[PDB]
Amino acid sequence: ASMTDQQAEARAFLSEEMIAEFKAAFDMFDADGGGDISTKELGTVMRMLGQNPTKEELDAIIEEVDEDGSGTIDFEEFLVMMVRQMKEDAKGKSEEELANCFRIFDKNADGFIDIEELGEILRATGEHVTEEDIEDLMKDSDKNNDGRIDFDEFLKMMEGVQ
Numbered sequence: 360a361s362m363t364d365q366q367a368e369a370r371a372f373l374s375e376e377m378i379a380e381f382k383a384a385f386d387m388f389d390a391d392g393g394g395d396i397s398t399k400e401l402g403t404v405m406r407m408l409g410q411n412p413t414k415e416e417l418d419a420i421i422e423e424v425d426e427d428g429s430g431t432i433d434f435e436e437f438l439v440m441m442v443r444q445m446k447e448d449a450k451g452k453s454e455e456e457l458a459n460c461f462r463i464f465d466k467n468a469d470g471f472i473d474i475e476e477l478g479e480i481l482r483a484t485g486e487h488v489t490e491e492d493i494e495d496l497m498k499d500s501d502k503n504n505d506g507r508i509d510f511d512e513f514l515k516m517m518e519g520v521q
């Protein structure tokens with residue numbers, strides 16, 4: 360992926376109204392109307408738009424985009440950086456939520472989901488699940504054949520591909 364390839368993929372990931380919303384905030388720091396902002400303002404615009412880069416991440420980005428020393432980042436490069444951050448933050452949110460889901464499923468807090476806990480959570484959804492359906496999910500998710508689902512197997516069960 361060239362930079363332009365990365366920029367075309369960044370644009371394809373976002374709806375056009377979202378792109379124009381991001382440009383409306385970006386434009387408030389341009390002033391000069393040139394299609395770019397100081398790299399000193401990148402963190403501010405990113406956080407205004409709901410992203411949370413660390414300082415180390417921002418330094419890494421600035422160094423990626425400011426090799427000519429102009430001290431600016433353009434809008435197309437800004438979109439590439441926003442999509443990278445959106446993907447990273449969403450990944451972190453999903454892992455955090457899966458760890459909370461496991462702590463709820465594991466009613467007895469022993470570090471495993473057993474067939475009784477699994478049957479009880481699935482029946483409470485209201486779905487017409489049978490004991491055979493519950494046993495089939497258990498057997499398919501239980502990689503090491505100990506009769507239970509630990510957090511590593513839970514992550515694989517839920518994420519599915521993984």
Ligand SMILES: [Ca+2]
Pocket residue numbers: 465466467468469470471472473476
């Ligand atoms: Ca348990």
Ligand SMILES: [Ca+2]
Pocket residue numbers: 500501502503504505506507508509512
């Ligand atoms: Ca197991």
